[PDB]
Amino acid sequence: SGAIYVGNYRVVNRHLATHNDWANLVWEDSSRDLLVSSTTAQGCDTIARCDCQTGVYYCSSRRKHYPVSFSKPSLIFVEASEYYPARYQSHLMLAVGHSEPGDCGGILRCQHGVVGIVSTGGNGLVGFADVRDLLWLDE
Ligand SMILES: CS(=O)(=O)c1ccccc1CC(=O)N1CCC[C@H](C(N)=O)C1
Numbered sequence: 045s046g047a048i049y050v051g052n053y054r055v056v057n058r059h060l061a062t063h064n065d066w067a068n069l070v071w072e073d074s075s076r077d078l079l080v081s082s083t084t085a086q087g088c089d090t091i092a093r094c095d096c097q098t099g100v101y102y103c104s105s106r107r108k109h110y111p112v113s114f115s116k117p118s119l120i121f122v123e124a125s126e127y128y129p130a131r132y133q134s135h136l137m138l139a140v141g142h143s144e145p146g147d148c149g150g151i152l153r154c155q156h157g158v159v160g161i162v163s164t165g166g167n168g169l170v171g172f173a174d175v176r177d178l179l180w181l182d183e
Pocket residue numbers: 059077122125127128133143144145146147148162163164165166167
């Protein structure tokens with residue numbers, strides 16, 4: 045579990061979004077596993093605007109932060125689940141690192157700020173849904 049709070053927005057994994065998130069819906073994309081909802085309070089997370097391929101992510105199943113090298117955002121096949129049928133997920137970045145069910149929502153950051161959130165994983169791999177192209181989160 046976990047979310048990004050920037051201005052009047054809350055960014056969460058779409059498969060984990062709440063009733064309140066859906067009642068205050070701004071934008072959602074099943075192919076990216078992202079949902080953004082509106083908030084009354086101000087969020088102070090800074091979003092990165094860069095092409096960094098190194099950073100640090102939070103792993104709740106280990107209660108630790110890990111440094112990682114990650115790939116550029118791309119279309120990657122993701123196996124079926126109680127949340128989605130088998131499909132390609134867009135804007136996805138992979139890294140060699142630990143992750144397991146329960147870790148989605150952990151933030152990935154570089155020196156410039158928030159890069160994305162854990163969205164997929166397994167087999168000594170971790171997948172991050174990128175948020176750096178969502179320029180409207182600032183304005
Ligand atoms: C079971 S796992 O793949 O090792 C793992 C690891 C870390 C974190 C999660 C998972 C499970 C997983 O990948 N998904 C279930 C939830 C929706 C995800 C999606 N984006 O389509 C896909």
